[PDB]
C-alpha cells in the first residue's frame, strides 16, 4: 500500500 496514493474519491468514479 502507498500512503501517498490518491486518498480522495476515484476521479473516474
Amino acid at each position: 500500500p502507498d500512503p501517498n496514493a490518491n486518498p480522495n474519491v476515484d476521479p473516474n468514479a
Partner: antibody, heavy 123, light 107 residues
Framework: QVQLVESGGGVVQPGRSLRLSCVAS????????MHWVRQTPGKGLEWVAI????????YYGESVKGRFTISRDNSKNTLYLEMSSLRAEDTAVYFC????????????????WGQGTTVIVSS | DIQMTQSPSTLSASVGDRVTISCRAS??????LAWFQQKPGKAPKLLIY???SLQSGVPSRFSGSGSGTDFTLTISNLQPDDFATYYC????????FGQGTKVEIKR
C-alpha cells in the same frame, strides 16, 4: 472557497487524552482525504496523520503511532483527532489540512489548511 | 521519512528584488515537492505544487524548479505582501517539511 475550522484545543495534563474536531465547508468533504499537521516554534511543521475519504485507510507519524487515532464523520462534514498519552512533545498548534484535490498526479500532498487550534500539554 | 534541508534560514530583501530559496531532499523525490507561504498567526498557503506548477490565484512572480533532490523557489519583483516565511514539503514518502526560510525587509 474551501473552509476548515478546528476546535477542541486547550490545556491538558501529561498522560491524559483530548479530542480535536475540524468542520469542513466549501467542497465535498466526503470525497476528500484529510490530514492533521502540527506546528511548534522549535521543531517547525510536522505531519501527524492522514485518513482516506471513506475512513477505510489511516496512517500516522511514527511518534504518535499507538497514541493518536484519526477518524471522520462524513454525515457531519467533520474530521477528528483523538490524542492519548499526551507528552510535552505534543504541545503545538494543530491544523486540519485537505489532501490535494486535483487528479493530474498520482502522488498526493495537501492543499488547503485550517486556522489551527492550540494544544498545551502542561501540569 | 525523508529529511528536507532548506536554505537559507533567513534572508533580507527589498521590494523589487529577486529572491531564491533552496530545498534539498535526503533521497530522490521526483517532482513531489510543494512550497507554502505562512505569515505570523495565519495558516500556510500553497504556492507551488509538483515542484513547478503555479497554483490558481497565486501571482506569477512565484515560480519553482527542480527535480530529483534539489529544488528552488524563486520570487521575482518581491512585493510588500511577500515578506513571510516559506516552507518546502515533500510528498513522495509520507509528508515532511523543510525548516523554513524567513524573508524579512532590508533597511
Amino acid at each position: 472557497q474551501v473552509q476548515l475550522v478546528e476546535s477542541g484545543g486547550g490545556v491538558v495534563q501529561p498522560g491524559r487524552s483530548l479530542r480535536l474536531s475540524c468542520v469542513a465547508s466549501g467542497f465535498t468533504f466526503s470525497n476528500a482525504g484529510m490530514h492533521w499537521v502540527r506546528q511548534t516554534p522549535g521543531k517547525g511543521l510536522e505531519w501527524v496523520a492522514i485518513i482516506w475519504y471513506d475512513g477505510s485507510i489511516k496512517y500516522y507519524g511514527e511518534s504518535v503511532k499507538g497514541r493518536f487515532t484519526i477518524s471522520r464523520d462524513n454525515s457531519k462534514n467533520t474530521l477528528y483527532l483523538e490524542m492519548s498519552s499526551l507528552r510535552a512533545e505534543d504541545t503545538a498548534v494543530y491544523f486540519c489540512v485537505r489532501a490535494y484535490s486535483g487528479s493530474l498526479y498520482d502522488k498526493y500532498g495537501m492543499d488547503v489548511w485550517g486556522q489551527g487550534t492550540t494544544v498545551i500539554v502542561s501540569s | 521519512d525523508i529529511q528536507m534541508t532548506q536554505s537559507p534560514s533567513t534572508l533580507s530583501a527589498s521590494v523589487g528584488d529577486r529572491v531564491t530559496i533552496s530545498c534539498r531532499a535526503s533521497q530522490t523525490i521526483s517532482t513531489w515537492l510543494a512550497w507554502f507561504q505562512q505569515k505570523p498567526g495565519k495558516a500556510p498557503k500553497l504556492l507551488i505544487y509538483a515542484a513547478s506548477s503555479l497554483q490558481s490565484g497565486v501571482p506569477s512572480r512565484f515560480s519553482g524548479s527542480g527535480s530529483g533532490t534539489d529544488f528552488t523557489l524563486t520570487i521575482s519583483n518581491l512585493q510588500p505582501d511577500d515578506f513571510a516565511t516559506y516552507y518546502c514539503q515533500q510528498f513522495n514518502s509520507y509528508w515532511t517539511f523543510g525548516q523554513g526560510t524567513k524573508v524579512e525587509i532590508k533597511r
